[PDB]
């Protein structure tokens, strides 16, 4: 235990701020799956597991290159050994200052240039190779291979370069089926490496790895992979696909208490499927994708620069700069952040195509940061034909001039509308600010287009509110960019639009003042509160055509519930605790 106000219970841990204000302002971050799992440079980061899979291409590749995995195991990648041709193979990165190709300073410079507000390494993957100076795990990068505390190295470089530190931990699945096809051994060390220790010992080692690392580098974000409490994702291994609840609650309490000692608001994450942690104090992470609508509470997306692996492989191909930038814009439009993974080579070199993606991302963010950083999601994420499918493992967004993504400042009086291309007619239509949206733009003081450099704006040529939409005639195209940003400065806050199929709630006796616009869905009190209007302060609800609303006093839509239909309505102050939109 560590001195703090948190005991290892759910009710104490649930008081932790899941997503602090800095996290909500950071928007974009970068991490790297680099480790002993990159040494083979074949298939995926899951080569450690698949190299023993019966009848796998990995097993065939391993047998044809190094030998049978029953004789030449992954511990040879860690500790060093010859292949069949006679070449020495080990994850032994050499610092470029000592004559090697591992230049961590160049990598951290590229990451800084990308515009990342949080960065850091993968501290430990499923392979059981701790990349810090561990005492609990002798299978680490200090005692073996490069003999260098890479996690401390990356932490020092990330802090020196003015970025928050995230450390990715994927050691829960190490003993929940990752090495299920590896040969049983009696060696207690290799048992530690291959997840063949008693469950109790393995959960204790999970917690101890977390403690060692979080005390060694004091990370701002703890990124946890699956197998915390994720039944159904550990194949057919005789295991619970979970970490002992006691150990998880003890980890949460330790990390939060150590954070109260450091005076730092910290974040820990869980895959949206893993129910090991709750969104009361933890952040739901969507892998290779994100929600299709605005999802509250605040969330995170972890994506990779490649659709195939998170680690480098000969012949790896990468996504485009547009996909990454457009996907970042959609995620931040829907109350979330983006954590992009890059894939350095086994020798510690970042390939030129990854360097170009990072520099294109950095160009866009250095030019339009005002629109992304320190902004919040609006009540309507965007307009356009191009939308993502929804959920994890979905395709990266690639939009065009017909697609708009909305962001707003914290004071809710500036609206950033980003077009995913340049319209050939130099026109932009914002349907949600039309007259049919019951929006009055009298308070609209200025529409600008962001220029070639930050702080350079050009006034819009002309605009007019039609019933169907707000029409905007664009000024001359600025310097080329993957997207173009319009800044609408209002006076007295951004008007509350009325959806065609949905409704709008306001903390006032009329449709005036602060309000939240809501489309089809279920809106908990957490949702409404994060939107900027606590449900116990609502006094007016305006409904669009045939949109039936179900009102609850529960902050979770549970219990006696009254109902309303289309048309205006006045609710007693405190009667609303939840809202369900239907039909
Ligand atoms: C491991 O222990 C089992 C049980 O005592 C034994 O049958 C097996 O031969 C041992 N293997 C090795 C490599 O020591
Ligand atoms: C989100 O809005 C889209 C608009 O196309 C709608 O189709 C979808 O049903 C809404 N959210 C969900 C999944 O309820
Ligand atoms: C934008 O994409 C949509 C959907 O693919 C397409 O229908 C439309 O023609 C595109 N517009 C432009 C200007 O590329
Ligand atoms: Na909380």
User: For the residues of 103-163, what is the DSSP string, one character each?
Assistant: -HHHHHHHHHHTT-SEEEEEEE-TT--B-S--SS-SSBTTTSTT-S-HHHHHHHHHHHTT-
Q: Is 387 in the pocket of ligand 3 (CB under 6 A)?
A: no
Q: Select from 467, 490, 513 the last residue of a domain.
A: 490
| Residues 27 and 89 reside in one and the same domain | yes
Beta strand 404-408 with 221-224 is unpaired
In a domain? residue 28: yes
Question: The domain spanning residue 481 has which CATH number?
Answer: 2.60.40.1180
| Residues 302 and 193 reside in one and the same domain | yes
Q: Select from 448, 469, 490 the last residue of a domain.
A: 490
Question: The domain spanning residue 308 has which CATH number?
Answer: 3.20.20.80
| Residues 517 and 417 reside in one and the same domain | no
In a domain? residue 225: yes
Give the three-state DSSP class for 179: coil
Residues 309 and 342: their CA atoms lie apart, in Å, by 10
| Residues 254 and 387 reside in one and the same domain | no
Question: Which token pair is 504?
Answer: 């709008």
Q: Is 347 in the pocket of ligand 2 (CB under 6 A)?
A: no
Contact status, residue 121 vs residue 158, Cβ threshold 8 Å? no
Q: Is 398 in the pocket of ligand 3 (CB under 6 A)?
A: no
Resolution (A): 2.2
| Residues 344 and 318 reside in one and the same domain | yes
Residues ≥6 apart with Cβ < 8 Å to 76:
66, 89, 90
DSSP readout, 391-433? BSS-PPP---TT-EEEEE-TTS-EEEEEESS--TT-EEEEGGG
Residues 92 and 90: their CA atoms lie apart, in Å, by 6
Beta strand 118-124 with 28-32 is parallel
| Residues 463 and 517 reside in one and the same domain | no
Ligand 4 midpoint to CA 414 (Å):
29
Ligand 3 midpoint to CA 402 (Å):
7
Q: Is 459 in the pocket of ligand 2 (CB under 6 A)?
A: no
In a domain? residue 199: yes
Residues ≥6 apart with Cβ < 8 Å to 580:
521, 522, 523, 549, 550, 552, 557
Q: Which of 292, 295, 296, 582 to mutate to test the pocket of ligand 2 (most atoms within 8 A of CB)?
A: 292
In a domain? residue 495: no
In a domain? residue 335: yes
Q: Select from 490, 524, 550 the last residue of a domain.
A: 490
In a domain? residue 305: yes
| Residues 542 and 513 reside in one and the same domain | yes
| Residues 114 and 70 reside in one and the same domain | yes
Give the three-state DSSP class for 566: coil
Compute, in degrees rounded to 10, the torsion defined by CA atoms 192, 194, 200, 205: 50
| Residues 382 and 368 reside in one and the same domain | no
Strand partners of residue 418: 405, 485
In a domain? residue 1: no
Q: How was this structure determined?
A: X-ray
Contact status, residue 460 vs residue 441, Cβ threshold 8 Å? no
Residue nearest to atom 9 of ligand 2 (CA): 520
| Residues 115 and 198 reside in one and the same domain | yes
Please name the helix (run of DSSP H) or strand (run of DSSP E) that holds residue 365, with its range, or none.
helix 352-372
Residues 315 and 317: their CA atoms lie apart, in Å, by 6
Residue 147 domain boundaries: 10-372
| Residues 240 and 103 reside in one and the same domain | yes
Contact status, residue 26 vs residue 378, Cβ threshold 8 Å? no
Question: The domain spanning residue 558 has which CATH number?
Answer: 2.60.20.10
In a domain? residue 261: yes
Give the three-state DSSP class for 463: strand
| Number of domains within the chain | 3
| Residues 228 and 127 reside in one and the same domain | yes
> 162: burial class by Cβ within 10 Å (0-12, 13-18, 19+)?
exposed
């Amino acid at each position: 235990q560590a001195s703090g106000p948190y005991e290892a219970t759910w009710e104490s841990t649930d008081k932790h701020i899941a997503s602090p204000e800095w996290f909500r302002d950071a928007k974009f971050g970068v991490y790297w799956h680099w480790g002993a799992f990159t040494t083979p440079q074949y298939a995926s980061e899951w080569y450690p597991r698949n190299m023993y899979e019966p009848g796998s291409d990995q097993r065939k590749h391993h047998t044809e290159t190094y030998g049978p995995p029953e004789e030449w195991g992954y511990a040879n990648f860690i500790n060093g050994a010859d292949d069949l041709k006679g070449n020495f193979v080990q994850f032994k990165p050499v610092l470029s200052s000592k004559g090697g190709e591992f230049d961590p300073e160049a990598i951290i410079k590229a990451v800084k240039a990308s515009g990342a507000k949080f960065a850091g390494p993968v501290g430990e993957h499923h392979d059981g190779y701790s990349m810090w100076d561990s005492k609990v795990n002798e299978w680490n990068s200090v005692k073996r291979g490069p003999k260098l505390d890479l996690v401390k190295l990356w932490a020092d470089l990330v802090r020196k370069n003015g970025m928050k530190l995230v450390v990715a931990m994927h050691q829960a699945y190490n003993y929940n089926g990752f090495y299920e096809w590896a040969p049983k051994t009696n060696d207690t060390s290799l048992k530690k490496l291959l997840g063949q220790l008693s469950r109790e010992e393995s959960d204790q080692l999970w917690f101890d790895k977390h403690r060692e690392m979080l005390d060694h580098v004091q990370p701002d974000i703890i990124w946890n992979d699956f197998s915390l409490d994720s039944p159904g994702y550990c194949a057919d291994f005789d295991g619970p696909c979970a970490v002992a609840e006691k150990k998880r609650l003890e980890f949460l309490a330790y990390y939060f208490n150590r954070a109260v000692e450091w005076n730092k608001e910290v974040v820990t994450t869980h895959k949206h499927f893993d129910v090991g942690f709750r969104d009361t104090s933890t952040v739901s992470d969507y892998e290779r994708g994100g929600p299709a609508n605005i999802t509250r509470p605040y969330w995170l997306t972890d994506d990779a620069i490649s659709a195939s692996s998170w680690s480098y492989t000969v012949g790896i191909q990468y996504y485009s700069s547009k996909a990454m930038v457009h996907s970042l814009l959609d995620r931040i439009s829907k109350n979330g952040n983006m954590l992009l993974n890059i894939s350095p080579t086994a020798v510690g070199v970042l390939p030129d195509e990854q360097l170009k993606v990072l520099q294109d991302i950095g160009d866009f963010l250095g030019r339009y940061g005002e629109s992304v950083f320190s902004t919040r999601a609006w009540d309507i994420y965007g307009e356009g034909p191009n939308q993502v499918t929804g959920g994890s493992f979905t395709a990266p967004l690639q939009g065009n001039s017909s697609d708009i993504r909305f962001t707003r400042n914290k004071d809710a009086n500036v609206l950033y509308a980003t077009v995913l291309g340049w319209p050939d007619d130099k026109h932009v239509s914002i349907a949600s600010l039309g007259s049919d949206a019951l929006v009055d733009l009298k308070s609209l003081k200025s529409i600008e287009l962001l220029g070639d450099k930050a702080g350079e704006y050009e006034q819009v040529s002309d605009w007019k509110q039609t019933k169907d939409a707000l029409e905007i005639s664009l000024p001359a195209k600025p310097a080329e960019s993957l997207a173009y940003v319009l800044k609408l400065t209002f006076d007295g806050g951004i008007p509350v639009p009325q959806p065609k199929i949905g409704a709008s709630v306001f903390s006032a006796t009329s449709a005036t003042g602060r309000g939240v616009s809501l489309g089809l869905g279920d809106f908990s009190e957490e949702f409404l509160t994060e939107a900027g209007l606590k449900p116990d302060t609502i006094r007016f609800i305006r409904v669009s055509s045939g949109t039936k609303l179900t009102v609850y006093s529960t902050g979770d839509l549970s219990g006696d519930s009254k109902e309303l239909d289309a048309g205006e309505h006045k609710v007693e102050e405190g009667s609303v605790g939840s809202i369900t939109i239907s039909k």
